[PDB]
Amino acid sequence: MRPLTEEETRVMFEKIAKYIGENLQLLVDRPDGTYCFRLHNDRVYYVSEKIMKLAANISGDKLVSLGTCFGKFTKTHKFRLHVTALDYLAPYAKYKVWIKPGAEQSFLYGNHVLKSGLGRITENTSQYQGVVVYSMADIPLGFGVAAKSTQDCRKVDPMAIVVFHQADIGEYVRHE
């Protein structure tokens, strides 16, 4: 459960920024103290610094359980974001898409959002912008990438993909 190298940090920072822009600082400078990132088995954990200062009396695998996995580094040296990071990033994601019931069901089965299921999308969402996907009830469902800009989304046919699926809460919230 070690600190990330400067290169690991950069890579993860850039990926996270694809969804929350310059808001990662909001995850680090919390009201209750500074939080940090630590690596354990290629998986990156978000944990309070206070918890880490006590790494002496607690095993790494117990420390593992105290933090939240945000994702893992791939052999291609990319950072794959895990849907477990959704609750933390969602409040800080500027570009959001709200999808209808049909799209919601498909997305939770790991599929893309088609135009017919687009309920609302944030203004000035650029093509390929990382977005957080929500239900019409404003519930975070996962991560996606805008297939078209906001303006272009208004103009595609019902069957066209408007959001590429990246990760969803169906992959695990099976209720078990």
- The partner residues of 145 in beta bridges, in order of sequence, read 130, 164
- DSSP percent split of the chain into helix, strand, coil, nearest 5: 35, 35, 30
Distance in angstroms (rounded) separating the CA atoms of residues 13 and 123: 24
The CATH architecture of the domain made up of 1-93 is Roll (3.10)
- Distance, in Å, from the CA atom of 134 to the CA atom of 80, rounded to the nearest integer, reads 20
Each domain of the chain, given as residue ranges in start order, spans: 1-93, 94-176
Coil vs helix vs strand at 6? helix
| CATH code of the region 94-176 | 2.30.130.10
Hey, which bits of 41-106 come out as E strands? 43-48, 68-73, 79-81, 96-99
**Alpha carbon 160 to chain centroid distance?**
24
Residues with Cβ < 8 Å from 25, sequence gap 6 or more?
none
DSSP tag of 110: T
Give the start-end residues of each E strand in the chain: 2-3, 29-30, 33-40, 43-48, 68-73, 79-81, 96-99, 113-114, 118-121, 130-135, 140-146, 161-168
Q: In 3D, which of 115, 127, 113 has the Cα closest to residue 155?
A: 115
- Which technique was the structure solved with, according to the deposited record? X-ray
Cited resolution, angstroms: 1.9
